[PDB]
A paper describes a structure:
Masked refinements of the ATP synthase dimer resulted in maps of the membrane region, the OSCP/F1/c-ring complex, the rotor and the peripheral stalk, ranging in resolution from 2.8 to 3.5 Å, thus allowing de novo modelling of the respective regions. The attachment to F1 is mediated through OSCP, which adopts a fold conserved in prokaryotic and eukaryotic homologs. IF1 in our structure is bound exclusively to the α/β-interface facing the dimer interface, thereby locking it in the ADP-bound state (βDP). The N-terminal IF1 region that contacts the central stalk in the bovine complex is absent in our structure. Because central stalk rotation and conformational changes in the catalytic sites of F1 are interdependent, the sterically restrictive IF1 binding in T. gondii to only one of the three catalytic sites results in the trapping of the ATP synthase in a single rotational state in both the dimer and hexamer.
F-type ATP synthases are energy-converting membrane protein complexes that synthesize adenosine triphosphate (ATP) from ADP and inorganic phosphate. These universal enzymes function by using the energy stored in an electrochemical potential across the bioenergetic membrane by rotary catalysis. In mitochondria, F1Fo ATP synthase resides in the crista membrane where it is known to form dimers, which can further assemble into rows critical for inducing the membrane curvature and maintaining membrane potential and morphology. Here, we investigate the mechanism for the generation of the unique cristae in the Apicomplexa, using a combination of single-particle cryo-EM, cryo-ET and subtomogram averaging.
Residue numbers in the entry:
A (entry chain I), B (entry chain H), C (entry chain Q), D (entry chain J), E (entry chain P), F (entry chain K), ...: 96 to 166
K (entry chain e): 1 to 65
L (entry chain g): 106 to 262
M (entry chain d): 41 to 183
Write the structure that this text describes.
Amino acid sequence: AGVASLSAAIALMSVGGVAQGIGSLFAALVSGTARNPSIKEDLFTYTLIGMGFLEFLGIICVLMSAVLLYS
Amino acid sequence: AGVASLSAAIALMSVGGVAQGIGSLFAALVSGTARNPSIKEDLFTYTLIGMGFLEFLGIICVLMSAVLLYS
Amino acid sequence: AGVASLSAAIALMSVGGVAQGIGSLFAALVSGTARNPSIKEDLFTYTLIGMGFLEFLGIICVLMSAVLLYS
Amino acid sequence: AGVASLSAAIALMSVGGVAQGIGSLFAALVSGTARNPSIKEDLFTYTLIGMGFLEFLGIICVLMSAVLLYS
Amino acid sequence: AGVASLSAAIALMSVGGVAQGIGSLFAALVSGTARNPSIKEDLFTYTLIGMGFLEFLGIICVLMSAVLLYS
Amino acid sequence: AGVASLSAAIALMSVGGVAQGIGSLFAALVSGTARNPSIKEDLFTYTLIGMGFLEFLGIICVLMSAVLLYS
Amino acid sequence: AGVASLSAAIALMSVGGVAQGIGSLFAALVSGTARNPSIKEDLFTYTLIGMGFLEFLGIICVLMSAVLLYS
Amino acid sequence: AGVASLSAAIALMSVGGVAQGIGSLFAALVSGTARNPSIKEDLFTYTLIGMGFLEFLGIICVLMSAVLLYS
Amino acid sequence: AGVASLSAAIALMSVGGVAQGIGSLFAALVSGTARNPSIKEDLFTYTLIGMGFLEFLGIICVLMSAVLLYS
Amino acid sequence: AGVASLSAAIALMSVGGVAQGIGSLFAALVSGTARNPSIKEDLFTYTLIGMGFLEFLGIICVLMSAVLLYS
Amino acid sequence: MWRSSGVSFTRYASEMAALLRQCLKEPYRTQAMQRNQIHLKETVYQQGQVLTRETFNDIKKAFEA
Amino acid sequence: AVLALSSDKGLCGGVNSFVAKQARIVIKENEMAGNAVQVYGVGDKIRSALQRTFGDRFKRIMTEVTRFPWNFGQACIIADRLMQDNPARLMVIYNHFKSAVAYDTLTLNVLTPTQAAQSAKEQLNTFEFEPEKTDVWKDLQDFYYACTVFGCMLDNI
Amino acid sequence: FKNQLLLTLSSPSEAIYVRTPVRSVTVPGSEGAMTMTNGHSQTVARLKAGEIIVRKGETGDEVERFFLSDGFVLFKSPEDDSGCCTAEVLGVEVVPVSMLDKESAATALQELLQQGAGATDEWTKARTLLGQELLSSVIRAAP
């Protein structure tokens, strides 16, 4: 009976790994800023590209939930 | 009819990743600050930006759970 | 509702991801205090900010659990 | 509609590892750029090759969800 | 009275998730004492603060286990 | 083919470890290239070798998925 | 031969985390010894304090496992 | 019955733990080569020993994925 | 009907964390020996202490698995 | 009774964790030999000791798997 | 290590190079210990009014005092 | 803190005269603004030149250095003595050896830990320090002191 | 000039190389040994002890061993016009391995252990341990 809700909840679990990846990204960002502020403006650019993948994958996950909570 | 509660709990079993990511964020912030204090104003500036995503993901990690308790 | 008792436990499982993060954060704090001790007053402040999120997140991981023990 | 959405979410669970790998890879990219900007363009390239695996695996994963939603 | 025991056993995961994190904290303390033996205090205070946080989390999880075991 | 579909879905959790290993390899490659670009190609060789193993493992699970999708 | 055995088995999942924490502790001790042997007697001391939690925490779960085997 | 196929899908979960080991080993190879290329062909030999274990520990479980499928 | 086997197999699963801890410990040993080769007896002693703790936990979980199997 | 297969398969998951440890251990060699290529001998000794322990663990896991299979 | 014992890197390097020189072969060891002879005469002052004068012929006693 | 390098034997022309002249100039310039000056020296000639006029500022003097051949061990001692008395700014006066019939007096403004902590060292971000910068800086600085004294004394000799 | 590695291996008493073109140079960093070649990034590193191993461009296979006690290494990028990347290995005492002895090494080790048995000062213990390190390295490095 609770098929759709359970499946959506199980699908939503990858947000943890997504957040871990984003944390690693921004940790490397702050570390590279501490190691060389002169190229700070460059590093953030690459960091955004990482988000351009990570959140995108995350977005797909949420879409699947929207597909699965209503069949 | 506790299957809704089960789905809400399963969807809530991803805040650990958000917490790990936030811990990595602030750990790298503190490390890079101890390496170079004079640039603190920048290290914080990017850090919040990361939170600007993670907490938002965390909000999803809450919202659907509440939805899974009712819908 | 027996399944409610399971739901709460699952909602508590996230603490395993929480505490790890907290540990990592304080680890970095200690490393900073081992590298540039003369700015402890800075680092702890930033550390508190991190806890200001994590504890709050942890509270959520508690609250719904208790809620899921009743609803 | 049990098995369909169940298998979909279960297969979708494995994108967190993809996100973690992406985060680690882009963190290495940022660190290397901080240490040696002169070969910046030479690093970005390699990271794309990594995507040529990781995202592709993710794609397969997502595709299998659909293959399990209307099997 | 069969689901309560399983709920408590499932809630016991945060114990290992917390021991992971206490280990990291004390490893950081050890490494800090190795890099700067002149500062033993101001490393044990922060370590004890983190210990208090993680002990509170463990107390939460054990309390909820004992609760669900009889409720 | 319900139980078969569930088996095929459960088969695809190992993809996370594959992606994590891939990310580790490409991170090490990117860092080594940031250190000594003059050993680019040689390193690439070793990298591809490791990737082959991971790729094989990936393909293996995919094959089993097909098996568990029909048999 | 029922649910009590399942619960007493599920309680043992925390031993992995406790073992990882102990490994991190003693790896940090070994590294600090190899770095600065001249404070060995100090580091071991702190290490024991860590055990004063970690092993104890593990024992708790083990005890609770028996509590879940004859509840 | 078909339920045995699930056992096969469980036997492939050890795969994706071997992948992290292979990734770590080959990443250490890459780093040690980038640091000290002069001894390249020695380090490769050591990896041939490591893969002497992991390459078995993977396929062994895959054999179980067959043996616990048809039986 | 065969629930004791399930409980035994579920209790045995902490060997993964035990092996992770052992590997991290001996890796720290090997690194500290590569750095400070004149200090091997003290490092080996601390490694033996850690291995004793970890083997104790492993034998505990194996004994509990045998008990739950032949209760 | 095919169900007794499942339990055996579950034990094999532990082997995956074991592989991770092995990888880390060999990395400590492959880095150490690059960090100190003069010795290359005592590192192999400690590696073999750790591999003996981990192979014993994996072997008892496999044996318990076969036992729960046939029994 | 030397930072924890309240020691300078120069002191550590000198006192270790001394041992390395002791591990030399005699024909080269003579020239090594010849080109590394030490003789100093420190004279401490405080607004004139010499507080002390002290000679040094060894690296260890030169760094200690 | 003014480290003046000089000799111990006479008949050296007038190189020590120029050294002491530059030292007097530096002291009289920096004592007006209010900077408390200390004087380290190498050789008895600078001592005989500045005893009567700036003898109430000496901190530590060394001599008999030119007896045996100059070596890095002789310089490390003086560098350690300078570091133990860590001042806020250090100057080094010596004679540069241009050619066999031409020298040149110079003054080296030398970096110190007080002046290093007040800078983020952004100029060295291009360099990858194998240990972290904070851990290797104190050793690089001690080496810098020793090498400075070494080269300066060689040129003066 | 050329796309070689311009090594200068320098001790206070003798400069063994000044602008020697080589292919790869191994050095025992404080973290671990490492081999510098052309294209290597700018870097500074502290050395602990051990056997520098030089390999000229003409040699390729032939090498030159040199024991170093302590010092620094400075790798500096190539100027755009020079076309050659430079490296400076400064050592407080840079001996060749031909001039080393294994018997006096063990004698000095024994005397160090004798002096350090009365462990009261931190510097004495530290010196005993570091001497043990360097003398074991000399023994393993001597022929």
